[PDB]
DNA sequence: TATCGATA
DNA sequence: TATCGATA
């Protein structure tokens, strides 16, 4: 409600629509769960959300480009 | 199935 | 200096 994985939110709202509200393609996605990355979303009060992975040690964005 | 442009 | 998402 607040902060959750990826895979989760997925689970939760089905790959499109995540994808949507990350901005990137569907296929991204799933093959980024496929892949298993420590990627974790906020959900900003007024339902925005936004992603960030855990890559080493380091906490980069979600995306990178 | 692999490159390439963007990023940080 | 290297990853990752998009493409074709």
């Known amino acids: 409600e607040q902060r959750i994985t ?3 939110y997925a689970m ?3 790959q499109t629509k995540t994808a ?3 901005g ?3 296929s991204a996605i799933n093959k ?3 892949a298993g ?3 974790f979303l906020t959900i900003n009060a007024d ?3 936004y992603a960030e992975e855990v890559k ?5 964005p979600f995306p990178s480009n």
Do not use: P
């Open 6 to 8: 990826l895979k989760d």
């Open 12 to 14: 939760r709202f089905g």
């Open 24 to 26: 990137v393609y569907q």
């Open 56 to 60: 080493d040690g380091e906490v980069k």
């Open 20 to 22: 949507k509200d990350l």
């Open 32 to 34: 980024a769960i496929h």
């Open 47 to 49: 339902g925005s959300v």
């Open 37 to 39: 990355r420590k990627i």
